[PDB]
Amino acid sequence: LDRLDAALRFQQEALNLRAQRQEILAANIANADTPGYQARDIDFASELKKVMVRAVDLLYRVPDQPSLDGNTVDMDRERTQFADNSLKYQMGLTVLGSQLKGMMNVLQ
């Protein structure tokens, strides 16, 4: 790679993984009522570590309580997951922005 991308590759990959994870969370929110559905999620830490070496596998979420229709997407746990995922996405966004602003300010 290059000296510039070497610094920001980690943050870019973190942002991309956050976007994909939020997409999966939105998908299993939208499919909350389809019977026979299984909630899916990404092992964020392991996937990030694997990516920062060189698609993404899906891990089924353990059902909270059983239901007759076969649907296994919870609501409260996934809502907390979505909220915290958005919060950490914004954290990564502002960290990358601060790094880029510092790099630009050094060159003035």
Partner: protein, 71 residues
Amino acid sequence: SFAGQLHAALDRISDRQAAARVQAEKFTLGEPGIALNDVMADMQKASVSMQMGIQVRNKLVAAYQEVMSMQ
């Protein structure tokens, strides 16, 4: 040589800008695979690379003129 190094650096900067521009074009055409969180990062990378290039050019040209105006 210095001329070759400068030519290589200019080619690299132009390549980075072209890659960012074509990625933005693919995103705006509606082609799937872009999440808007990488096009902005690539554009910022191209902009900071161009800023470094123009800073180096300013320093070099100022040095050249001040060393040519000597006696």
